[PDB]
Design an enzyme around this catalytic site. Structure first.
Site, PDB file in Angstrom:
ATOM      1  CE1 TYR A  72      36.801  42.175  38.985  1.00  0.00           C
ATOM      2  CE2 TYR A  72      36.881  41.351  36.735  1.00  0.00           C
ATOM      3  CZ  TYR A  72      36.411  41.288  38.024  1.00  0.00           C
ATOM      4  OH  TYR A  72      35.545  40.308  38.358  1.00  0.00           O
ATOM      5  CB  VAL A  73      43.913  42.228  35.493  1.00  0.00           C
ATOM      6  CG1 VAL A  73      44.816  42.378  34.370  1.00  0.00           C
ATOM      7  CG2 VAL A  73      44.668  41.980  36.772  1.00  0.00           C
ATOM      8  CB  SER A 120      38.797  39.996  32.749  1.00  0.00           C
ATOM      9  OG  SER A 120      37.800  40.552  33.544  1.00  0.00           O
ATOM     10  CE1 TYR A 122      38.455  35.302  39.437  1.00  0.00           C
ATOM     11  CE2 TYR A 122      40.188  34.631  37.937  1.00  0.00           C
ATOM     12  CZ  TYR A 122      39.775  35.261  39.070  1.00  0.00           C
ATOM     13  OH  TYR A 122      40.683  35.832  39.852  1.00  0.00           O
ATOM     14  CD  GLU A 175      40.301  37.458  42.345  1.00  0.00           C
ATOM     15  OE1 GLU A 175      39.968  38.081  43.356  1.00  0.00           O
ATOM     16  OE2 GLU A 175      39.529  37.150  41.453  1.00  0.00           O
ATOM     17  NE  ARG A 178      39.612  41.870  43.052  1.00  0.00           N
ATOM     18  CZ  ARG A 178      39.643  41.406  41.840  1.00  0.00           C
ATOM     19  NH1 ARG A 178      39.906  40.122  41.611  1.00  0.00           N
ATOM     20  NH2 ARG A 178      39.432  42.226  40.853  1.00  0.00           N
TER      21      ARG A 178
END
Ligand SMILES: CC(=O)N[C@@H]1[C@@H](O)[C@H](O)[C@@H](CO)O[C@H]1O
Ligand SMILES: *[C@@H]1O[C@H](CO)[C@@H](O)[C@H](O)[C@H]1NC(C)=O
Ligand SMILES: Nc1ncnc2[nH]cnc12
Length: 261
Positions: A72-73, A120, A122, A175, A178
């Site tokens: 995660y950012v 965060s 989405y 992402e 990921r």
């Protein structure tokens, strides 16, 4: 902590790939992997985070600090007014938030918060990006770069801009990290803005599911079909790790054991 730097502003698929790999390599638990998919470490790794120093438009940088555990950012910093302007999602809450601030702004003598006045998720970012969906938020290196530009050093930017940037960054960084798929999307679309296809989104959304699935996959068989989306948004029922593996850059940390290869 490590900084994968990625200059989105001047880059190439391959650099992005490298960035991705670096990011994955940095993000991944070195030892964790399910089905040859590196997996993010738990949230107890020595190095919890990783910085992704994105440089974008006008060589402006934004450092994403990614939690290695789920990539995660956690927020980002941008040099702003000689300050490490750290923007942390408001659901980076306490000590992580300090660490995120600190990590973002470790080798900056000055810092200033410009919180990400939103979490965060989405949904959040999309909401904040005022997009129905980040499907609608084109991704792209240039976009990222530009987004970086819209944010980094920018005294003001709207949450929208930020959120978009975050959408972009998150997706193109986390992402993409990921998901090779997403990476690949970016790379495939490297020279273009692209609307993240449903698979991007889906993968994004399902990363944990996937990671879980993959992690919990026995000899490649996902415990449950993973209902994912193909790029074109069609249902993509992944039964086996190998079906999804290629898309996977990082497994979200999933504790317990998995077929590491
Ligand atoms: C603790 C951690 O690694 N959790 C990630 C979560 O952030 C993500 O939202 C979900 C997949 O969508 O996978 C899980
Ligand atoms: C990108 O960087 C290369 C060298 O790193 C340089 O030749 C080129 O001018 C740069 N391009 C842009 C548009 O920033
Ligand atoms: N802040 C974030 N970083 C990485 N992945 C995400 N997915 C949704 N929000 C995210």
């Amino acid at each position: 902590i490590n900084t994968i730097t990625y200059d989105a502003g001047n880059t190439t698929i391959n650099k992005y790939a490298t960035f991705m790999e670096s990011l994955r390599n940095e993000a991944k638990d070195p030892s964790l992997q399910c089905y040859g998919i590196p997996m993010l470490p738990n949230n107890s790794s020595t190095i919890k985070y990783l910085l992704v120093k994105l440089q974008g438009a006008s060589q402006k940088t934004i450092t994403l600090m990614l939690r290695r555990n789920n990539l995660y950012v956690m927020g980002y910093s941008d040099p702003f007014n000689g300050n490490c302007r750290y923007h942390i999602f408001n659901d980076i809450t306490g000590t992580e938030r300090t660490n995120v601030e600190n990590t973002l702004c470790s080798s900056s003598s000055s810092r200033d918060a410009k919180p990400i006045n939103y979490n965060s998720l989405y949904s959040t970012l999309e909401k904040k990006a005022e997009v129905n969906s980040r499907s609608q938020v084109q991704l792209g290196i240039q976009i990222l770069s530009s987004d970086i530009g819209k944010i980094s050093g920018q005294s003001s930017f709207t949450d929208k801009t930020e959120a978009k940037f975050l959408l972009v960054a998150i997706q193109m960084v986390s992402e993409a990290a990921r998901f090779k798929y997403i990476e690949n999307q970016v790379k495939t679309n490297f020279n273009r803005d692209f609307s993240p296809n449903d698979k991007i989104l889906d993968l994004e959304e399902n990363w944990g599911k996937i990671s879980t699935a993959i992690h919990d996959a026995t000899n490649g068989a996902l415990p449950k079909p993973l209902e994912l989306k193909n790029a074109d948004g069609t249902k993509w029922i992944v039964l086996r790790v190998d079906e999804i593996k290629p898309d996977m850059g990082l497994l979200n940390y999933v504790n317990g054991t998995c077929q590491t290869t």
